[PDB]
Design a protein around this ligand. Structure first.
Ligand code: ZN
Ligand code: ZN
Ligand code: ZN
Length: 178
């Protein structure tokens, strides 16, 4: 197994996947690494199983259809993975915890949002459809762009949004377009 956490790339108290060589801190894995279960399979492994059980799940889909899906166990897991993929980028640190807004010439957003809030919402089963999760994720970056205006710090929102959007297309197998 790996000697660093797959998500944050640090050593520490790691849990090892029994079916691939990745390792995780307890609360870096999403969902949090489970108390018992030997063997244990990580979310990358669980997602791969879904695809292997239903190869056709990788044919192209329309985003509008994906968003209306009910959050049954497999959609729940896909959203958890997609969230985890964003945390894997170091620039997610800027969006992880609750922000605040006091900048000359700008007003804070109407509806602040951050990754740990989305994490809790997923954990507490607050989303009924994929759309709920995706809207909150996009809002994070949209709020950032709107607040930081012409400061070059706005680019961090663009960068992390691109990570989100690419992984969304991949995980939910959105039909490739030009
Ligand atoms: Zn970690
Ligand atoms: Zn694994
Ligand atoms: Zn099938």
């Amino acid at each position: 197994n790996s000697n660093i956490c797959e998500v944050c790339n640090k050593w520490g108290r790691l849990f090892c996947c029994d079916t691939c060589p990745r390792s995780f801190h307890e609360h870096c894995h999403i969902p949090s690494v489970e108390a018992n279960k030997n063997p244990w399979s990580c979310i990358f492994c669980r997602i791969k199983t879904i695809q292997e059980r239903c190869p056709e799940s990788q044919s192209g889909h329309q985003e509008s259809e994906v968003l209306m899906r009910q959050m049954l166990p497999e959609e729940q897991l896909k959203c958890e993975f997609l969230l985890l993929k964003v945390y894997c980028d170091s620039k997610s640190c800027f969006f992880a915890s609750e922000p605040y807004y006091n900048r000359e010439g700008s007003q804070g957003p109407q509806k602040p949002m951050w990754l740990n809030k989305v994490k809790t919402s997923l954990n507490e089963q607050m989303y009924t459809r994929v759309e709920g999760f995706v809207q909150d994720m996009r809002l994070i970056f949209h709020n950032h762009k709107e607040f930081y205006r012409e400061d070059k710090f706005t680019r961090l929102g663009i960068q992390v949004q691109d990570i989100f959007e690419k992984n969304f297309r991949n995980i939910f197998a959105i039909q490739e377009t030009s």
